[PDB]
């Protein structure tokens, strides 16, 4: 499934990501846009031999177990299949764990490059 700006925004506010550990909804909409283009089934393979899965392209060497990254740390303690669903539940709970580390949303390259220091509320302005 591919999401819309306002659609993703609403769903992420229903999943309590607005101001989770201080990060406003716009930050998450922006990050998701530049990480997967609102694609729930986006997959990207890396140099490690890992895969990035889902709306927020969560890595399989650190956060999920696919059975295809050996030595994964599975920090979100989840299968990577759950990050490829049309339901954003698992992606959200995992991103909440990722952001609850001291690095924060600096674990998402897109966010660092395209959202940090910008008016991210622009990504929710227009949505009701």
């Amino acid at each position: 499934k591919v999401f819309g700006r306002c659609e993703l925004a609403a769903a992420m506010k229903r999943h309590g990501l607005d101001n989770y550990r201080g990060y406003s909804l716009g930050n998450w909409v922006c990050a998701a846009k530049f990480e997967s283009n609102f694609n729930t089934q986006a997959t990207n393979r890396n140099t490690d031999g890992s895969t990035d899965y889902g709306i927020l392209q969560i890595n399989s060497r650190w956060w999920c177990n696919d059975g295809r990254t050996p030595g994964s740390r599975n920090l979100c303690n989840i299968p990577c299949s759950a990050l490829l669903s049309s339901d954003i539940t698992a992606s959200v709970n995992c991103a909440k764990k990722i952001v609850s580390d001291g690095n924060g949303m600096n674990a998402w390259v897109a966010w660092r490059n395209r959202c940090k220091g910008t008016d991210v509320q622009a990504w929710i302005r227009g949505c009701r």
């Epitope: 506010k13 229903r14 999943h15 309590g16 990501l17 607005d18 101001n19 989770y20 550990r21 201080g22 650190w62 740390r73 599975n74 920090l75 303690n77 709970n93 909440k96 764990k97 609850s100 580390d101 001291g102 690095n103």
Partner: antibody, heavy 113, light 108 residues
Framework: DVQLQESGPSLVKPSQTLSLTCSVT????????WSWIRKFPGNRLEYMGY???????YYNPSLKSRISITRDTSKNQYYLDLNSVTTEDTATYYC???????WGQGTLVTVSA | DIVLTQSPATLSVTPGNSVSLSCRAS??????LHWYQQKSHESPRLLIK???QSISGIPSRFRGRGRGTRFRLSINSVETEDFGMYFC?????????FGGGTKLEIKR
């Protein structure tokens, strides 16, 4: 699967330092975030702190000046240090993962002279 | 520092009836409220995560409802094995805070 065990003194003297140990079997401590929680005699639970993957440690502001959470990958363990303990710090201490689904059995610590 | 107040503090129920437990927050916490059960001789047991999500194995008679500043745990057709303390916890802000508890007593 992970099994958690708290270990430490049952009697600590006031003004001294409390030390606890959470031993983890089943999975590495590099597979989760690990935390310390205590339950006071009045059935009041307090989240003491947690350590993340980068080594960032988050401490309750109330105890920030007296608490230190450390790790040992060599022994698959993490440790709690609470300084300047008082009689009000008598409680049952639990180590647990940040997910909150794997808990230890609890270790009772009485702070008394 | 979010303050969580739980109500009522103690409730007695005849097995077969439904109960609702309330957890109120001092500030909006979205859906980041978790419910735990602690019985005698036992470490806290996660029952509900992010305030409506189920946990594998936990009876479907447990229900989570709420978003924002007021949340609730419902136990429909309460059974005998549901005696214990019930705690709510937030995870939206640090420090992570708990509620005071609700002791459930089973009438017999």
């Amino acid at each position: 699967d992970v099994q958690l065990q708290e270990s430490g003194p049952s009697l600590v003297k006031p003004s001294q330092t409390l030390s606890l140990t959470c031993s983890v079997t089943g999975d590495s401590i590099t597979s989760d975030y690990w935390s310390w929680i205590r339950k006071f005699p009045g059935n009041r639970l307090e989240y003491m702190g947690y350590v993340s993957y980068s080594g960032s440690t988050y401490y309750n502001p109330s105890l920030k000046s007296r608490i230190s959470i450390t790790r040992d990958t060599s022994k698959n363990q993490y440790y709690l240090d609470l300084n300047s303990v008082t009689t009000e710090d008598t409680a049952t201490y639990y180590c647990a993962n940040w997910d909150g689904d794997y808990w230890g059995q609890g270790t009772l610590v009485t702070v008394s002279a | 520092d979010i303050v969580l107040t739980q109500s009522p503090a103690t409730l007695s129920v005849t097995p077969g009836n439904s109960v609702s437990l309330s957890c109120r927050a001092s500030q909006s916490i979205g859906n980041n409220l978790h419910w735990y059960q602690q019985k005698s001789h036992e470490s806290p047991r996660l029952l509900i995560k992010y305030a409506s999500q189920s946990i594998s194995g936990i009876p479907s008679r447990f229900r989570g409802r709420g978003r924002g500043t007021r949340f609730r745990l419902s136990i429909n057709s309460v059974e005998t094995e549901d005696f214990g303390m019930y705690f709510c916890q937030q995870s939206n802000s640090w420090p992570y805070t708990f509620g005071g508890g609700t002791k459930l007593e089973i009438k017999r």
